[PDB]
């Protein structure tokens, strides 16, 4: 019926426009990147900072937390998904490696393991790197539009990518070809996220409409006449029955993945909801907008 969850914690540490966040595997230790070139690790429960990495680029576009929790990825227009190691024998966090092999902005780069990471770049491509060698292990081309987002399957055998081509395509991690082509959107795609089952993926475009695609193929749509504003970040719950889209109405809109109705509205933010995240266990929702706040919702 209704989902009325409020700002259970407020994280006021950030001092610039928050651009991207990512939950850890243990449902804690948020990674959050802001416009001050700062990449801050939070403990969600106690609301305390443990690491504050100074990024090279103030206007960072994406940040990522490794599944092992020892590495953190930073990416933007500088064509680099820098990997930083947290567990240092010297006791001080320092940069570890840099991956520079693209001519377009890495809008999102997320890990698979401690060694290999997939990146979605602004020059109409994706790339699986191995950070042990530094060479771009696999390249992914076939999008005729600026790639804006990608999502990683739970088994990490497929990763889906959405571009400004108004189409979202899968890519195999190893072989590197797109099996299924989905073109049912209407404007530029700004976010995408795998369904928890891994057999489907939701995609939020700038046409003020979200579309959930299933690989058995437009499969489902989420839109209304009142909303005339786009979607920035899309996230799924643990069970997948609930979806959250960061509309630019200065507040999140919570939809139902199966009913396509108005499940709720998460108001409380002053600007564009830059990024959304849901825990592995479905406990908390972390929302990062340009008001420099990580709003936690439970």
């Amino acid at each position: 019926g209704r989902i009325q969850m409020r700002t259970r914690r407020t994280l006021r540490g950030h001092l610039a426009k928050i651009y991207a966040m990512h939950w850890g595997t243990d449902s804690r230790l948020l990674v959050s990147a802001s416009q001050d070139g700062k990449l801050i690790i939070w403990d969600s429960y106690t609301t305390n900072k443990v690491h504050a990495i100074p990024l090279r680029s103030s206007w960072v576009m994406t940040c990522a937390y490794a599944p092992s929790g020892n590495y953190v990825a930073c990416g933007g227009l500088d064509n680099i998904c820098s990997i930083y190691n947290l567990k240092t024998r010297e006791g001080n966090v320092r940069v570890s490696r840099e991956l520079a092999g693209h001519t377009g902005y890495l809008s999102c780069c997320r890990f698979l393991d401690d060694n290999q990471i997939v990146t979605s770049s602004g020059d109409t491509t994706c790339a699986l790197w191995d950070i042990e060698t530094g060479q771009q292990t696999t390249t992914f081309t076939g999008h005729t539009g600026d790639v804006m987002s990608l999502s990683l399957a739970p088994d990490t055998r497929l990763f889906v990518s959405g571009a400004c081509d108004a189409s979202a395509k899968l890519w195999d991690v190893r072989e590197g070809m797109c099996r299924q082509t989905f073109t049912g959107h209407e404007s530029d795609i700004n976010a995408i996220c795998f369904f928890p089952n891994g057999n489907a993926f939701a995609t939020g475009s700038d046409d003020a409409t979200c579309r959930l695609f299933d690989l058995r193929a437009e499969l489902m749509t989420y839109s209304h006449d009142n909303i005339i504003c786009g979607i920035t970040s899309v996230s799924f719950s643990k069970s997948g029955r609930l979806l959250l889209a960061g509309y630019d109405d200065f507040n999140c809109n919570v939809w139902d993945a199966l009913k396509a109705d108005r499940a709720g509205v998460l108001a409380g933010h002053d600007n564009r909801v830059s990024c959304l995240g849901v825990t592995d266990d479905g406990m908390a929702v972390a929302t990062g907008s340009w008001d420099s706040f990580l709003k936690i919702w439970n």
Binding site: I3, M5, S237, K238, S239, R241, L242, V278, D281, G282, M283, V285, N298
Partner: peptide, 7 residues
């Protein structure tokens, strides 16, 4: 297994 939907 959905703490968001139900407490």
């Amino acid at each position: 297994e959905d703490p968001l939907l139900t407490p």
